[PDB]
Design a protein around this nucleic acid. Structure first.
Length: 86
RNA sequence: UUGGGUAACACUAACUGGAGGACCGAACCGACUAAUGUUGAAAAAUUAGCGGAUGACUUGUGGCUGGGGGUGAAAGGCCAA
């Protein structure tokens, strides 16, 4: 993931200016990495060690969403709708 | 295929679909048990009872391979009683 590719995905999801670590921002980056990693699975079926990597990643995202939906259900439906998870 | 659960793997339910030298059975094939017949209707036939059924299947016509040769899922079976 390129620098600008990361900085841009953080800005488009950033709640406000200078928003680096937020529920929607975090999950955004994780989702991205997950996508690239999942696509990395379509190929290299043998790469088992990487499978564990995404497991932790997706687990983190699952917990982040669980926290969000639990607190603000509105920000949740919005986040998912924008990304495309679930 | 749809729905649901899962990160994925894959799972569950419903629906769809319907293969299978598969099963019971028609064309049909086979033909175990008895009597009739046995100068018989018949040089192996009749009757009751009895077994099997989309395939490497069955069948018409045409054509090929021949004598100690051929042909034979072989029984020394068949090559016009």
């Amino acid at each position: 993931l390129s620098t600008e590719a990361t900085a841009k995905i953080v800005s488009e999801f950033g709640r406000d200016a200078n928003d680096t670590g937020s529920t929607e921002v975090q999950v955004a980056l994780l989702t991205a990495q997950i996508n690239h990693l999942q696509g990395h699975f379509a190929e290299h079926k043998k790469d088992h060690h990487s499978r564990r990597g995404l497991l932790r990643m997706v687990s983190q995202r699952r917990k982040l969403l669980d926290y969000l939906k639990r607190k603000d259900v509105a920000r949740y439906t919005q986040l998912i709708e924008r990304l495309g998870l679930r």
